[PDB]
Amino acid sequence: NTTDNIDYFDISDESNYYLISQLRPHFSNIYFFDEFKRYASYHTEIKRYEDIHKTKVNSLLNEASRAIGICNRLKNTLLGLINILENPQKFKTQRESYDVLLRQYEEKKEAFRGCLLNKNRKNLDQIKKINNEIRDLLERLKCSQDCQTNVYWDFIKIYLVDFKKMPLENYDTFIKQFKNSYLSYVDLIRKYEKQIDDPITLQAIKFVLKEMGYIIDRFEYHLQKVKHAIDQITAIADGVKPKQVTKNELKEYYFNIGNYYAIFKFAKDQLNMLNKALIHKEKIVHNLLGELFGHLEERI
């Protein structure tokens, strides 16, 4: 097999509000529930959030993983097609045309991504329910007009330190190197299709390049999302430092920095996975080009 996992497929719901990943915890919103555990431990009135987290948040997370796993049968079928399409030797030892296999790939890709969303729809509703319960729990803060913002500000300072650990410049360097090499390969295959008589090898390379393009798009999408999250929290740190605020304001403060930090934490893992997926595709492309040039040498 040329490809052993397809963790790089993701899907958003129709409202574009939630993004579902195959990587646990599957939604960045779960990391928000995790960050709120940290905020609540500094407010005596809401320390009971720890019991909400260990019951409702843990159950939601395990329900999310269960939903993802319901789609494993479609995933395995899709992996089977991918491995025929990427591998000329496997294509030559079956009898479906390359065009029929490509159409089946498109159908199974959308059925698999659709399963990831469909089986998680009730989980998305439960995110909204737990968010609402957190908003209600915050009512128990004693303050009303005079809520202190020191915990909020302290966590912004922590987040800025955490942001420095992320290889953000290296990710820019990587996706640029990779996009440029991708576009070079695409242009190169377009020339080879006229100079080299090897449609079995060329069609497989073209397919792998098509996959690489999908994964590049995902990388760029998640990279823009985490840069936006860092920029938003950085602008808070660079802006007017609050004094005391109303309880309603403090709720929104924690939801804002908790959700953007959750986006950052979730993007870390998603980008690392997509970087690995792109390196894996590079390996496959180069080995296919080895075959292409070796066949060309043989035909002189």
Automatic annotation (TrEMBL):
<feature type="disulfide bond">
    <location>
        <begin position="143"/>
        <end position="147"/>
    </location>
</feature>
<feature type="disulfide bond">
    <location>
        <begin position="71"/>
        <end position="115"/>
    </location>
</feature>
<protein>
    <submittedName>
        <fullName>Reticulocyte-binding protein 2b</fullName>
    </submittedName>
</protein>
